[PDB]
Amino acid sequence: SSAVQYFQFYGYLSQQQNMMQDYVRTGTYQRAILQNHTDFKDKIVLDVGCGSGILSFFAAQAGARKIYAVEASTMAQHAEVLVKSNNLTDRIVVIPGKVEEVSLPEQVDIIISEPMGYMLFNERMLESYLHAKKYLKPSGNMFPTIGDVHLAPFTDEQLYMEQFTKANFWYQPSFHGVDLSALRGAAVDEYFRQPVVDTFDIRILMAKSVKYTVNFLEAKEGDLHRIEIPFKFHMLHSGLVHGLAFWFDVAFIGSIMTVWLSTAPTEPLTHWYQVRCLFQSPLFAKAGDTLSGTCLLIANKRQSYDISIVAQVDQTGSKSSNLLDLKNPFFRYTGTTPSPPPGSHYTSPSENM
Amino acid sequence: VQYFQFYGYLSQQQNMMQDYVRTGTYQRAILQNHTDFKDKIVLDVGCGSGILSFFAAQAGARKIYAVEASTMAQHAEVLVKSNNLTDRIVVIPGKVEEVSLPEQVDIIISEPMGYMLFNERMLESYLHAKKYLKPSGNMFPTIGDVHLAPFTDEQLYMEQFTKANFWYQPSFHGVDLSALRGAAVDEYFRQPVVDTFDIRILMAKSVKYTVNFLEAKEGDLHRIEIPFKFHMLHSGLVHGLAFWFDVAFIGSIMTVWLSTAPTEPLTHWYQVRCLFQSPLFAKAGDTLSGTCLLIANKRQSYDISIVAQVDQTGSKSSNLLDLKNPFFRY
Amino acid sequence: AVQYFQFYGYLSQQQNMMQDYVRTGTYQRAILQNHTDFKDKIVLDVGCGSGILSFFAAQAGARKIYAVEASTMAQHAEVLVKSNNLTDRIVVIPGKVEEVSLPEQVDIIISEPMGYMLFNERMLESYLHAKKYLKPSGNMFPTIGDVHLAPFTDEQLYMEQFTKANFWYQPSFHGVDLSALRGAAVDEYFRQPVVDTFDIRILMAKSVKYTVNFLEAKEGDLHRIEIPFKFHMLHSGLVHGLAFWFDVAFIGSIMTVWLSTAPTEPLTHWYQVRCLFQSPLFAKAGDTLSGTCLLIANKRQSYDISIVAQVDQTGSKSSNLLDLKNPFFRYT
Amino acid sequence: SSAVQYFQFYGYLSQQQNMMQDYVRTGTYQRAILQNHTDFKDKIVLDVGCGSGILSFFAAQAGARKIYAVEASTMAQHAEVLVKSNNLTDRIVVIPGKVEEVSLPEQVDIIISEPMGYMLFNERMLESYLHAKKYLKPSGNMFPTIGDVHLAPFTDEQLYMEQFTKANFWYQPSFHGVDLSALRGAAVDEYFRQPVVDTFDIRILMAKSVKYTVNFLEAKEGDLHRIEIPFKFHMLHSGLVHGLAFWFDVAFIGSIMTVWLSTAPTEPLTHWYQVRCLFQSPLFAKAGDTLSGTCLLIANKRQSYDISIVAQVDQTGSKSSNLLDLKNPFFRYTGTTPSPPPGSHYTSPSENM
Ligand SMILES: Nc1ncnc2c1ncn2[C@@H]1O[C@H](CN(CCCl)CC[C@H](N)C(=O)O)[C@@H](O)[C@H]1O
Ligand SMILES: Nc1ncnc2c1ncn2[C@@H]1O[C@H](CN(CCCl)CC[C@H](N)C(=O)O)[C@@H](O)[C@H]1O
Ligand SMILES: Nc1ncnc2c1ncn2[C@@H]1O[C@H](CN(CCCl)CC[C@H](N)C(=O)O)[C@@H](O)[C@H]1O
Ligand SMILES: Nc1ncnc2c1ncn2[C@@H]1O[C@H](CSCC[C@H](N)C(=O)O)[C@@H](O)[C@H]1O
């Protein structure tokens, strides 16, 4: 259905290029695969969504005997050219098609893949990554092995006001002689259903994070159809909570060492950035209060999730419920350094010049 | 399809409404020609928010049929009710090709122009809607002029060549990508560059291609052939062709023009530039002749072929372009 | 070989080198400050040109100076010696220092044999060959040479050369397809050393050094020169190639004097030299750039250069050929 | 010899590019071949020193049946690659070697070449071009067909002084304590033996040019070993004559039309520019005087000419005799517009602004 558009997007070389040029990502995968050469040398490997084939080449540098590289986009055509020109035709096998519908010659010793999306789960490629375990030997391994999602409440007044400023275009009685007021509410609802793709200063976060772990060795493809993330935040600061901030970490658990790829706002940026879900009604909280609630991710037919966030301040009973659409996020990043919150100065800035 | 979902968002209707030149030229063109709307029947093909039907209602139209296929039709009918015009503006959800109208109309109004005028292939629906048009009916816009002109922009050319050279690395993290160097260059230079530019970079007076919406058939736009013969005013490197367009509202009281030229204030259409993989050298006085051929595709766009040659020297350049994968250089 | 000595046979070239104030004044100061290494001694000037260095030796008190010059500049040199009244101290001997015979062994050899990257022109071999005339505790001015290498980032230069090479990427230059030769064009242009100066900001790691000791080295060492390097990257960026320059030291009895062609120092007719990678290498600060620069002597009195550079963390490798015989003089 | 250094120079693609990028040169050759297609249509052609092969390609565009493209530098290898990739292997035969020492299968109907150097004659490739006539049918044609060398007396005080300024470096009694004066005369002599490659404003010319024609259809290889150019100038202006200026034209005399390629200072610049030979003793002449003399080019073993220029003003008998070496010219061009001589203002500049 919408799979056509998805595989059209990853068929352009310029997109593969954007992902390969993310040094954090490609470098961490290369480090993780080569530093665990005992997990690869002369073993069988499966690259789920090989794209250019970069990960299979990394697997080859580690000494794999044979690597099955599955690719469903037309990038399979270009991928085979790199294997022939890198004289690895005898160890890398390009298979055009989807990992679900293809046939593999044999069970593999280890599976490698880069299936993470915004908030880890977006794009629903982890389901294909776990589906691939039907080709995995009883003692096989998976790179990445586990993925951790993180959540924290945030305060950002300017991000929050921005939505009503954009929507208030509709609240004028004579836009070229037409009254648009009747659509203001609908415009507001639309903008708040967009998760914001951006970075931020860590000082806007108001409580230590909370983590939902997906163990790719134990999880089933069905575990990813309904993801329920409960949270109970102890506020470090007492502000207005305009929503929740999401990021993720993944770990490659190999024989020699475990390697981490992290997209935290404390780490170097990546092409995943961070994702923020705004509350249409911000929640006020004291410091020490508990912000309790649930984040419910419900898979949809269009390769994404419907996000439901219900949060409440237990001491005051103040409740906020929000719905978001992760397939239509708002890309807000600019490149500017992130300005810090006001009221973050505990000593005179003038006496520090 | 993805197309009608995109235009189902209020934020997109807003982005196009906040284009002041576009909206104000449409309103002024309609209002100053209120005689072509007084007590008449109107069809608005793709009304979106309904802004154009409201312009028609302001001009005195007795009844306006507003066809919209995206979910925007629901919101459009909310503005009709809250503006107390429900007896004059009739929203009809669906595609103009599929809906049934109660009667024939005196005039069709629409905003079907895309990049290079032809993008999005909504002109075909604007023309197809003429099956509901009375024998002497009129159309806003009446005609569309596509303008093309050769340009020189060294920075843009090296900008794209730089990105294509990523695929020339013999050892990117130990991997040889050079085998794909050729596909990378094809793909990048197959990107129309959507942006504005200063008129300084044009090396010849523009050439014009006219589409008359009153006389044209939906089939004409399946394959559009634009021949060009440029007379070069300056010497140097021709890195490609630049496209922009004008449309004219030919009404009873006056004709009003809407332009996306680089000398005029900016629109959400900007201008479009097609790059040659290898620029062409030309002197002042030379002639640059060739053909730009647009063949419609199933993905709501066109496959573009540009054949150009310097007649004096025989230097030839052939380029195919994908209007489906633009490069917004904003 | 004939073309080499015709070139240095023109008085205008000798002028171009003599008008290099840093060069000529540093040689005089190094010679005169160490006058005890010259007083009442025998001297050999290898490739005297106009004679300038022999005149510095006579100024320092040398009893007799043998000035060897193989171009026709030897005859002009003889004229300056007569008109400067030094016929009893400076003896011009025409011919190559490899082929002439000298009346006695010398206490010190002086020369100016450095070329681009120090080794260009392959005159250091003749400077070292002349050591057969050197007494057991003799000295040599210059005494040691330090070649310096450092990676650099310079986008405009890289695209400047790529623009030139891309002329051969045309499908119809006057109706003729040249694209079949784009690969040969890029190979040729990027084989060209870029002779120019540059601001030290473009360097991304502290320079690495390769030292030649003229007192100890033998003429054979310079037929194949292997230069290892291991750079610790200080900035994150694209490495577009390596930059080369050199210092030489006059290690005299009284003091050591240094002559430098570094980009932080005033300009010399040697400028600096850069080798471009066809495909730049990406490196982050903290990474290590390791590799080898290899100079293989050839018949045209120059070197075939092979530069292999590698980012140790990422495995990005780059191998480049360079022909010192076809440099690109970019200075204007 | 110098042949080695000569053919090494033309093996670099950057050099061929420099010559191909001279639009005047390459464009005029293309026009001259294509507009005379009757001289090429289904005929046998010989391209002497093809370099990239460009001229052969032009002759193929005009319809020639077979072209023999002779090249002595290693550019011959790259020339064959262009012929294969342009699908012309059945009509263009690249022959590596020197035109004097190679063999052709057959006689040709027409010979094409670009053998002109500074002052037309420099580098001595016209001799190879004329030598190639051993392969020409009794009524064959040659492109170019005739060459015109133009001479004219000029006045340029700043160019003239520039030489003494450069040589007077040697006229100091203490250059780091060394008296250099003895070499001043030798230094002056050296600089004046350099012809100057540059362009100039035609107003520095003091008499109508004189021309010496070589007819390539009739000239013999030995004619070019000793070239005697008598001149007799009628001075249009009174002044100091600092030397003579040289340029050249070639004409392609085809069946349909004659096409001219000119390096005159009145025409668009080319990579040949113009060449000026300075007199060490300038000659004074007033308008109406006659400047008579001879310009004698004596071929030498290093692929160039020794030039002797003797001029005298007949009215005064004032003589000047100068020797120049064409193999060590001074390339003076910059790109600055040539400033016009003083005082060429016959009307007040202030009354014109
Ligand atoms: N069902 C599927 N079967 C096979 N491949 C798929 C499938 N779904 C998505 N992919 C493939 O995975 C590639 C993208 N993917 C990262 C997206 Cl965040 C891996 C890129 C590359 N191998 C890297 O790791 O850097 C894309 O080419 C896509 O087509
Ligand atoms: N094998 C040789 N034997 C004798 N002379 C040689 C030899 N090789 C080169 N030379 C001569 O020494 C001169 C080299 N020259 C600059 C080198 Cl970049 C030094 C000029 C002179 N000492 C100054 O600094 O002013 C040239 O004149 C050359 O002819
Ligand atoms: N005796 C010879 N035999 C064969 N080749 C020769 C001979 N003498 C000179 N050449 C060759 O002709 C080429 C020079 N020629 C320009 C001279 Cl200013 C090339 C122009 C070329 N046809 C263009 O227009 O691009 C050089 O490549 C040279 O190697
Ligand atoms: N065949 C078709 N039938 C009906 N509506 C169509 C259509 N093709 C496109 N549309 C709709 O027409 C609109 C194009 S832009 C609408 C802008 C509006 N006329 C204004 O001036 O503000 C979109 O809402 C699109 O979804």
Swiss-Prot record, chains A, D:
Subcellular location: Nucleus; Cytoplasm; Chromosome
Boundaries of every SAM-dependent MTase PRMT-type domain copy: 3-310
One GO molecular-function entry: histone methyltransferase activity
Name of the top EC class for this enzyme: transferase
Keyword Signal included in the entry's annotation: no
Activity regulation field: Methylation of H3R17 (H3R17me) by CARM1 is stimulated by preacetylation of H3 'Lys-18' (H3K18ac) H3 'Lys-23' (H3K23ac) by EP300 and blocked by citrullination of H3 'Arg-17' (H3R17ci) by PADI4.
Superkingdom assignment: Eukaryota
Mutagenesis / variant outcome for changing S85E: Abolishes dimerization
Assigned EC number: 2.1.1.319
Keyword check for Metal-binding: no
Tissue: Ubiquitously expressed. Within the brain, present in proliferating cells from lateral ventricular zone and dentate gyrus (at protein level).
Positions with a binding annotation for S-adenosyl-L-methionine: Q16, R25, G49, E71, E100, S128
Reaction it catalyzes: L-arginyl-[protein] + 2 S-adenosyl-L-methionine = N(omega),N(omega)-dimethyl-L-arginyl-[protein] + 2 S-adenosyl-L-homocysteine + 2 H(+)
Region Required for nuclear translocation: start-end pairs: 203-236
PTM description: Phosphorylation at Ser-73 is strongly increased during mitosis, and decreases rapidly to a very low, basal level after entry into the G1 phase of the cell cycle. Phosphorylation at Ser-73 interferes with S-adenosyl-L-methionine binding and strongly reduces methyltransferase activity. Phosphorylation at Ser-73 may promote cytosolic location. Methylation enhances transcription coactivator activity. Methylation is required for its role in the regulation of pre-mRNA alternative splicing.
Sites of Phosphoserine modification: S73
Gene Ontology CC: cytosol; nuclear replication fork; nucleus; protein-containing complex; RNA polymerase II transcription regulator complex
Quaternary structure and interacting proteins, as annotated: Homodimer. Interacts with NR1H4. Interacts with SNRPC. Interacts with the C-terminus of NCOA2/GRIP1, NCO3/ACTR and NCOA1/SRC1. Part of a complex consisting of CARM1, EP300/P300 and NCOA2/GRIP1. Interacts with FLII, TP53, myogenic factor MEF2, EP300/P300, TRIM24, CREBBP and CTNNB1. Interacts with RELA. Identified in a complex containing CARM1, TRIM24 and NCOA2/GRIP1. Interacts with NCOA3/SRC3. Interacts with SKP2. Interacts (via PH domain-like fold) with C9orf72. Interacts with PARP1; promoting PARP1 recruimtent to replication forks.
Family named by the database record: Belongs to the class I-like SAM-binding methyltransferase superfamily. Protein arginine N-methyltransferase family.
Name of the protein this chain belongs to: Histone-arginine methyltransferase CARM1
Source organism phylogeny: Eukaryota, Metazoa, Chordata, Craniata, Vertebrata
Name of the gene this protein is made from: Carm1
Portion of the parent chain present: 145 to 497 of 608
Swiss-Prot record, chain B:
Lineage: Eukaryota, Metazoa, Chordata, Craniata, Vertebrata
UniProt GO cellular component terms: cytosol; nuclear replication fork; nucleus; protein-containing complex; RNA polymerase II transcription regulator complex
Shown residues within the full chain: 148 to 477 of 608
PTM annotation: Phosphorylation at Ser-70 is strongly increased during mitosis, and decreases rapidly to a very low, basal level after entry into the G1 phase of the cell cycle. Phosphorylation at Ser-70 interferes with S-adenosyl-L-methionine binding and strongly reduces methyltransferase activity. Phosphorylation at Ser-70 may promote cytosolic location.
Compartments where located: Nucleus; Cytoplasm; Chromosome
Expression by tissue: Ubiquitously expressed. Within the brain, present in proliferating cells from lateral ventricular zone and dentate gyrus (at protein level).
Enzyme category, top tier: transferase
GO MF terms held by the record: histone H3R17 methyltransferase activity; histone H3R2 methyltransferase activity; histone H3R26 methyltransferase activity; histone methyltransferase activity; protein methyltransferase activity; protein-arginine N-methyltransferase activity; protein-arginine omega-N asymmetric methyltransferase activity; transcription cis-regulatory region binding
Effect seen on changing S70A: Loss of S-adenosyl-L-methionine binding. Loss of protein methyltransferase activity. Localized in the nucleus
Primary subcellular site in the record, as a coarse category: nucleus
Entry's EC annotation: 2.1.1.319
Function noted in UniProt: Methylates (mono- and asymmetric dimethylation) the guanidino nitrogens of arginyl residues in several proteins involved in DNA packaging, transcription regulation, pre-mRNA splicing, and mRNA stability. Recruited to promoters upon gene activation together with histone acetyltransferases from EP300/P300 and p160 families, methylates histone H3 at 'Arg-17' (H3R17me), forming mainly asymmetric dimethylarginine (H3R17me2a), leading to activation of transcription via chromatin remodeling.
Regulation: Methylation of H3R17 (H3R17me) by CARM1 is stimulated by preacetylation of H3 'Lys-18' (H3K18ac) H3 'Lys-23' (H3K23ac) by EP300 and blocked by citrullination of H3 'Arg-17' (H3R17ci) by PADI4.
Keywords: Chromatin regulator, Chromosome, Cytoplasm, Isopeptide bond, Methylation, Methyltransferase, Nucleus, Phosphoprotein, S-adenosyl-L-methionine, Transcription, Transcription regulation, Transferase, Ubl conjugation
Residues binding S-adenosyl-L-methionine: Q13, R22, G46, E68, E97, S125
Reported effect, E120Q: Abolishes histone methyltransferase activity and reduces coactivator activity
Family: Belongs to the class I-like SAM-binding methyltransferase superfamily. Protein arginine N-methyltransferase family.
Segments forming domain SAM-dependent MTase PRMT-type: 1-307
UniProt source species: Mus musculus (Mouse)
Phosphoserine sites (modified residues): S70
Protein name per UniProt: Histone-arginine methyltransferase CARM1
Positions of transmembrane segments: none
Cross-link (Glycyl lysine isopeptide (Lys-Gly) (interchain with G-Cter in ubiquitin)): K81
Region feature (Required for nuclear translocation): 200-233
